[PDB]
Amino acid sequence: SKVKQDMPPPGGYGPIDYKRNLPRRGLSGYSMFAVGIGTLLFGYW
Amino acid sequence: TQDTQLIAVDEKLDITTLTGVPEEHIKTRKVRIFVPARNNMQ
């Protein structure tokens, strides 16, 4: 019988992510200010 | 032999007051100073 201990798989393990991943999401500041201004305008009207 | 302000002191060193040992375990104890005997088993 051959030896049998805890070993990596023959092809190794798949890659593991470690780098930071904070996705970019949202609109630009121009869009936010335009929306905020238009909301107030319609409210006023 | 060195600039340490050599102060004359008696040659009866007594550190009992600084050891923190309770007074019962200084005067009443009796220590034995010896080279241990060889264990006759070995």
Partner: protein, 115 residues
């Protein structure tokens, strides 16, 4: 070498001077300790305890031993003043819970084997 270096005092009179200063400080501190820690003892009792603690070391003749005793006494005084000690620490000088141990030969013989 033949001689040794001092801690602070180069002589026995200097050691006595510092001992007297420490005794003064402790004697003045005792009433504030009694008030602040809310001790159930009297100021006379506390000052007599301070004196009896000082009298334990009256047999010391080495100025360096006297200096180290003064250093440790000032340390204890600073623990008492700054209220680093609790009431239990101040009250440990008075062994109120420990029973009166025997002193004569006969009672020690009666209670056990210890000399």
């Amino acid at each position: 070498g033949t001689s040794v270096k001092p801690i602070f005092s180069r002589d026995m009179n200097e050691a006595k001077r510092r001992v007297r200063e420490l005794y003064r400080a402790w004697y003045r501190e005792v009433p504030n300790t009694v008030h602040l820690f809310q001790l159930d003892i009297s100021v006379k009792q506390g000052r007599d305890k301070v004196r009896e603690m000082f009298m334990k070391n009256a047999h010391v003749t080495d100025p360096r031993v006297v200096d180290l005793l003064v250093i440790k006494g000032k340390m204890e005084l600073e623990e008492t003043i700054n209220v680093w000690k609790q009431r239990t620490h101040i009250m440990r000088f008075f062994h109120e819970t420990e029973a009166p141990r025997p002193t004569d030969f006969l009672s020690k013989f009666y209670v056990g084997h210890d000399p």
